[PDB]
Amino acid sequence: NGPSRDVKLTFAQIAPPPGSMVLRGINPNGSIEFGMRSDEVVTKAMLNLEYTPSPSLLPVQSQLKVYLNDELMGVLPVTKEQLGKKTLAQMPINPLFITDFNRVRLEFVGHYQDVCENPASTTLWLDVGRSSGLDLTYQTLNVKNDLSHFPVPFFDPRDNRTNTLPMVFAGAPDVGLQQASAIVASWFGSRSGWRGQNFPVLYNQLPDRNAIVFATNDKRPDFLRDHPAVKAPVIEMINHPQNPYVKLLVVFGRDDKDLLQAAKGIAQGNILFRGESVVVNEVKPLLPRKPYDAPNWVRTDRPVTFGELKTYEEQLQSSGLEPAAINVSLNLPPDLYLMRSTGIDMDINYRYTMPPVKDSSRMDISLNNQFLQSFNLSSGKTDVSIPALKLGATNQLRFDFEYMNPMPGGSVDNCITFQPVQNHVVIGDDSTIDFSKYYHFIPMPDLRAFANAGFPFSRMADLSQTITVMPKAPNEAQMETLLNTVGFIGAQTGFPAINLTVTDDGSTIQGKDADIMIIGGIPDKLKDDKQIDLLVQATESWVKTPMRQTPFPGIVPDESDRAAETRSTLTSSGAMAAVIGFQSPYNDQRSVIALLADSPRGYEMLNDAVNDSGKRATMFGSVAVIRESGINSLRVGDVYYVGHLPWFERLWYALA
Amino acid sequence: NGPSRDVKLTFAQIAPPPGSMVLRGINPNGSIEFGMRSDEVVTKAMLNLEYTPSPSLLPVQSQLKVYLNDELMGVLPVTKEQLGKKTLAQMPINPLFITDFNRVRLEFVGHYQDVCENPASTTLWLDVGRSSGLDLTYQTLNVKNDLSHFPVPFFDPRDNRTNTLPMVFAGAPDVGLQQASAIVASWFGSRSGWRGQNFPVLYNQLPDRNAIVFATNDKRPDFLRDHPAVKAPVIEMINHPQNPYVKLLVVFGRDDKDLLQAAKGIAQGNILFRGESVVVNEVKPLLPRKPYDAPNWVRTDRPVTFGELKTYEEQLQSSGLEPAAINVSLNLPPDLYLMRSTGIDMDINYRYTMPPVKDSSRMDISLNNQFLQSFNLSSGKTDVSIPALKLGATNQLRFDFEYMNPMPCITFQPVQNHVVIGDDSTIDFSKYYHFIPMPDLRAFANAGFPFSRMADLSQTITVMPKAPNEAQMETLLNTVGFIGAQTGFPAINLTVTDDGSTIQGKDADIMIIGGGAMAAVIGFQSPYNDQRSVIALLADSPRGYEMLNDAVNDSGKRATMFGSVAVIRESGINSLRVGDVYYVGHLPWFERLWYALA
């Protein structure tokens, strides 16, 4: 009935970062994870395995077991012909046991002797290659047009892929339509988060996937011509006119103000979505946002507990003979002034299963893949000071419990066989880390801060102090750039950009206390700015190169190194794009971030760089050149500080 | 369909000859690391091994495991016929798992008993001969003509070999063409610093490899007498007319001024390179270079943190059962005055995994394989003083963390250890002075110091013959590339001349190139300025020029150059200190008085 879709899930993508897995007698389990959308059903599942059982393995006694959601799918005994050789195995997977979240676990049973044997012998291994995969077939279901499960058909949280959500307009959008689409894109990005954002833009065209359609009583796409006129903003979930398995979210309104009201209702009142059509009556902003109040950032009004940092329950606990590391994500306001702090105070309350005798078992605390401190297990609330030099906008805290498991072996005459006992390790939810004793002071421009948190615009999570400058009649590429650059900011903040202001004149921003975002090229007034270190015309580009580009500089800007050495102007037909940042001429505390492209291919490259988190993480400094090869960043230009340092700190640190 | 290249690698750790690599229970791992050029793929790979397993090993329980990027390529179980005898075993390597950086690991699983096994038993060993290695067959690809990867096909950073980059002209170059070629060679040497640099020169002959072609409207090579006339300096990436795998970079311009502008654009504005052709419109300098601002050298204006000495992240940390040594490279300007103070102060912050009980675990600090001082790991700050007499050449600072790994029969899984050297560790060089007697060829052969005091070679004039030969251009390109490699910066402001009358009465250093085979390097004081100097690169025969270039590009030969005059002949390299001795610098009066009194 519904359309089908064949996917191959290679172990290198859905496995631990190495991709491969060596199953031993002491660590016999290894799992892969995959989810299923609420509008899809698996009709055919097959697990292809490429593994090499160790020689010296007893053939029929050594086996490899495959589990799906703790249900046995089959067993692969190690035939004598397979000892020490690469083997190809096809294990069918029953679709009746596939649910929203699915774990496929490989269990290895291994024996090398008919007599006394050591489970931890290093000769009992079976490594599964990363070329192994899980072939799946998905069939789309005809879900009913109910506005409950509102995001589900468009963004499904059970799907870990990039949320590709097309947006359909009648034509070139006006300022109000651009603002409403930006609000919707920001909300969808905040919902999708780490999965990624992608908003293809179609003008008067029906797409082949689930999409959002913006319509007005006057300006509407072709397929909505027969739709009756509306008296209020109406949100309808209708079927695709040609594909009943494709859903359309039609945001209909009398005009741009009605569409804006509907977008705000989507952003702030989606909990009341029901039926097949909803009319938005009024959204009342009772309370404004405060600086640095993004839901995805660490609160700075009081010490934050580890419970408020975990994203899912049972995250701060691990079990097993060798328990997996515990990871806590620390997201901070990018302008936290930590250049002077000796260290950040962190009180850790950790519980573990004590080994019977004193050994070298320990718990290792690692920040951003760097070892910080170690605590011996054979020893309440421990005080740990983490240096602030390596604290960025996005941080990862890892707690590794290295266990030396002393298992007896008896004597030479008489052996003993033991059953290993698993260990339990817990990091308490009462553990706290304090970030409330620091000020907001950053050496702008910081394209790293931009690409990591949208800082100049995410200082207010609703983007109320941000103005976006767009061309008069933007095309699909420019609208895609705006939607993607708003969606990724929404993803980092966790809050939709309800109060974002989009302008077109380019001169109304004069004398306004707002950070500026430029998409369709720098206006004439700001084009002659002396702080711009990179400008891209249709085919002519010039850049300013710093005196010294240290690969790993300290947090101190070192303005002597950042001084521009030479300015080189080059012209070519090859595509390029750039993101630049400079001080606003109208306010010393404000900033301007401009996304520049010279061609459709340049816009494609810029959009890909914005969408890809890995490509974004490579942006730093003041200018980020995007080419076919990749992204190259320069730390060039003047340094201006945004924030307020009280005179207490300045006087205290004047005398060291 | 392209050319193929065969290489043979050898295990990294191995041992000094005539030793061999032995894998034991403590660390049964042997690794081979190699990088891949972006224009090459591996067509056939194979690991040849010559190993002698211990005669007291359980045969089939003991195995050899080969990994490639943490992917098992195969296993080599020990056989009863192989116990105590030399065994030759081959293991194919799948090219599908080869990436930019590759690691081939040999893992040893050893067993001598069924119960009560001691991992530290002396009977668990596997000797691997030095003849064991990896046989690879690279194949050259036809890469796209994109300047976004501008240096990739000419100088590949992932290539560890010497970068041989032929330079093609149209004839005897003029002064402007010489200057532009020198700028380009300086930039390429700067990009390929610690690896060798060689720039063969051809006058009207296309080469068989990647090359840089300099052409003007009036003067073109024979194969370029079809390109339309250009109205601006143009840099173009084109295929070789008879070999689509060779690739050429064509620097086309109206005249020598346009070629110079294109060279400066290559040196500075390479971040804007895109497409198959770029047009350099204007390279406008804004700021000059201060002395001793070469990026390769340590800062002399403020204390240097260890983070700024890092070439890659995670260099200062190491993990494992026995963590590997941590190496920091220090390049010092070869004029610091260290005849007054005892040494150089160091502040070191290091964190480590504490052993469960106090033992003889220690950290060793080594300077150029010379043991300096050991510290004990038990409780982490540390203040050290380093004597400084290795100016110019690169210095390796090694931190070796040796753990005793005490034994708690009973079988246990060993726990890995983490050692970290802080990025806030500080070494100081800002509060010193610049003073050494200039007429030393060691300073030249190590850093190009008289000319490298300014990275851009602003205060340097080069004198060349009227109609230079291929060898006469090659020596200039080689020396400018060597200076660029030592500095880390292109020589954009280098001045070349054809007649010696311009250098009269100029406050700038002079580098003269002129004339069985004899090659001589002469250094003496500049007549027109007491603080300047002149280094002459003289050679009579073309063979003499060739051996001079070989000496200047060979590190071992450069290490045998000292004094004021060096003479290069087929019998060897001889250098005798002749002439007077004078000093350069700005030593204060009271410091001079204190030094004289001391």
Numbering used by the authors:
A (entry chain B): 67 to 445, 465 to 741
B (entry chain C): 67 to 445, 465 to 493, 500 to 606, 659 to 741
Task: Quote the authors verbatim.
Bacterial cellulosic polymers constitute a prevalent class of biofilm matrix exopolysaccharides that are synthesized by several types of bacterial cellulose secretion (Bcs) systems, which include conserved cyclic diguanylate (c-di-GMP)-dependent cellulose synthase modules together with diverse accessory subunits. In E. coli, the biogenesis of phosphoethanolamine (pEtN)-modified cellulose relies on the BcsRQABEFG macrocomplex, encompassing inner-membrane and cytosolic subunits, and an outer membrane porin, BcsC. Here we present cryo-EM structures of the E. coli Bcs macrocomplex positioning all seven BcsRQABEFG partners and multiple c-di-GMP-binding sites.
We demonstrated previously that contrary to the canonical 1:1 BcsAB assemblies observed in purified samples from R. sphaeroides (Type III Bcs secretion system)23 and G. hansenii (Type I Bcs secretion system), in the assembled E. coli Bcs macrocomplex BcsA associates with a BcsB hexamer whose periplasmic modules of alternating carbohydrate-binding and flavodoxin-like domains (CBD1-FD1-CBD2-FD2) polymerize via a β-sheet complementation mechanism between the FD1n:FD2n+1 domains of adjacent BcsB protomers. The structure of the hexameric periplasmic crown is refined here to 2.35 Å resolution and reveals to near-atomic detail the molecular mechanism of BcsB polymerization, with more than 3300 Å2 interface surface and a free energy gain of −22.5 kcal/mol between each pair of adjacent protomers. In it, the synthase associates in a non-canonical BcsA:BcsB stoichiometry with up to six BcsB copies whose donut-shaped periplasmic modules assemble into a superhelical crown with stacking carbohydrate-binding modules likely guiding the extruded polysaccharide into the periplasm and towards the BcsC periplasmic scaffold.
